[PDB]
Amino acid sequence: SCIQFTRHASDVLLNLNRLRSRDILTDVVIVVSREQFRAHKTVLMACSGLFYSIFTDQLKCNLSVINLDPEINPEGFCILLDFMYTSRLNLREGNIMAVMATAMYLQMEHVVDTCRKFIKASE
Amino acid sequence: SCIQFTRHASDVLLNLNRLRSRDILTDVVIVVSREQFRAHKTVLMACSGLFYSIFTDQLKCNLSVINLDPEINPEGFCILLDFMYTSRLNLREGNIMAVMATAMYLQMEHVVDTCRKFIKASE
């Protein structure tokens, strides 16, 4: 018999992004080919199967720095980190291959699906 | 020129609630008249003007335990904490006064608004 507030989840995510933009309560640095990205462990886990696995590990949960595979493109990561905090994906002809490869590595199934569809339309 | 995934914010919140239910990466205990509630500081800040003010304070941001005013009802708090993580509010005739008072104290403007409307309909 609950009532539901339609915009609550979107409003929560918007506020989490405001905390990220002001570097408030960020608890991890993600290193991608020397580029550094500050974020909230919980948001990374909520969006990515890879971060979920990493931060539920009894040893890795305590790390303040996580280094990604050297094949990961920093721009592809930046676009996906923006998507995690906003639901908006900046998908372009010039970045789609790097975005799909990064989403496959991060285990972000819905992003992988839209990249496969956009690539299939261009062939 | 971004594309948007409609269910992303809801899916993020659902995963944050799963982390709460398994006590994963919770970083604060909220004490309400001896009852204890574990939560994520970021989610509390994203939902409440009071928690936003508390955890942006240079001294309080580092506290692992926060004690609420003794007038706050633990059931009212529990219903609001559930709303924060799910967008669902268990509003009932028997709890509406405690829920409205707790939402006013926590500074959760949309909850206060729906309580005022439901109370006005009953008079």
Binding site: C2, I3, Q4, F5, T6 | L89
Partner: peptide, 4 residues
Amino acid sequence: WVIP
């Protein structure tokens, strides 16, 4: 607010 809605009835979910």
